[PDB]
Design a protein around this ligand. Structure first.
Ligand SMILES: N[C@@H](CCC(=O)N[C@@H](CS)C(=O)NCC(=O)O)C(=O)O
Ligand SMILES: N[C@@H](CCC(=O)N[C@@H](CS)C(=O)NCC(=O)O)C(=O)O
Lengths: 209, 209
């Protein structure tokens, strides 16, 4: 650190890393970039892949939401207790990323038309995580092992935004439901989740959710 | 190990991890799954995310192509010399994954219609890697640091399949071009790349490239 998050005024792909920071009692700065400032071109051109989030950690500059998560993960000790757990953490995060991509596709590509089918296929998309939970201490702790990993933050966010998209989509998944309530109850995380810093930011940038 | 790759008879998302194994002098088994065997349902139903590749390493079973790459990476010492390089390796791999996803989209979604635009936007998509190369020892060594990382294998594959899609797409990028020739020249990798094991496998599963 110091940590600096450069992003649009939305939760989007920074929601998980923000929860991770808050949960771990870390302090950071939010550098807000408006859509008008972005259309000016300057910043976009200076971005490695021409996109945000951009993350500053001391003299280190990173791009890619999952790179930021893994960086915080290996640097803060949220990346498994050993090499085997590390692989499982990755396997979870990759699964989360795959579904997040379909979700982002729905939101910005064809929300009105595709929402129904998307929701029909939703349970098959969530089942894997319920399964992973059931194979780890009956899903009583975290997604991998008995300690938090950056994959928890990313999975938790995925679940939270899908409950908004399709309320009760977790009722059919006992472990996932209990997992969400348990994590959301963690003091610092709970505080953050209830703060205007989170609540007053839309989930996505096109007003859809 | 022993390593076992369970995948369809295509290069696809296993190409990079295969080059990595070969380049590092590792031995492994190829478990081929035909489309017919897949349509029977049994295997697919048992896969965490209902997809392949599936990777076996001793009693460890993994899924997700990038999870396999990172697993081989941290286990074989191809994941940066320190935490900072590790982050950069991730940043590179995430960029590779983003473009691979658009590539896979083109190939299986609308190859005939979208190919032209895709190719128009190609240089802007490759520029970032040329830039990363230029900022690391003038691009004389690897994508990150002076040692190989799993990101090299993934980036190399991305470049190779794009030269097939749009020949000469690398002519405008000096470092990327020299980088490809240099890596492709490594003895074991060169041997592997010239073997029927690689050559006689199509790049994708729908006959398009
Ligand atoms: N794979 C990247 C995706 C980044 C991305 O999609 N960024 C969007 C906002 S969520 C963006 O910068 N859009 C503006 C643009 O493409 O010009 C990541 O994981 O962060
Ligand atoms: N994100 C996964 C994607 C896996 C994937 O797309 N697998 C395809 C083959 S490349 C598949 O199994 N298709 C058959 C199906 O979905 O039933 C990874 O990185 O491996």
């Amino acid at each position: 650190p110091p940590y600096t998050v450069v992003y649009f005024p939305v939760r989007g792909r920074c929601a998980a890393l923000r929860m991770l920071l808050a949960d771990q009692g870390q302090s950071w700065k939010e550098e807000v970039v408006t859509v008008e400032t972005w259309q000016e071109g300057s910043l976009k051109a200076s971005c490695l892949y021409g996109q945000l989030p951009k993350f500053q950690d001391g003299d280190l500059t990173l791009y890619q939401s999952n790179t930021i998560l893994r960086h915080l993960g290996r640097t803060l000790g949220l990346y498994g207790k050993d090499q085997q757990e590390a692989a499982l953490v990755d396997m979870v995060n990759d699964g989360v990323e795959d579904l997040r991509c379909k979700y982002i596709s729905l939101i910005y590509t064809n929300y009105e038309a595709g929402k129904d089918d998307y929701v029909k296929a939703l349970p098959g998309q969530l089942k894997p995580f319920e399964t992973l939970l059931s194979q780890n201490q009956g899903g009583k702790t975290f997604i991998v092992g008995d300690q938090a990993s950056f994959a928890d933050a990313n999975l938790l966010d995925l679940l939270l935004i899908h409950e908004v998209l399709a309320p009760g989509c977790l009722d059919a998944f006992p472990l996932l439901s209990a997992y969400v309530g348990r994590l959301s109850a963690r003091p610092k995380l709970k505080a953050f989740l209830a703060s205007p810093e989170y609540v007053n930011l839309p989930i996505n940038g096109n007003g859809k959710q």
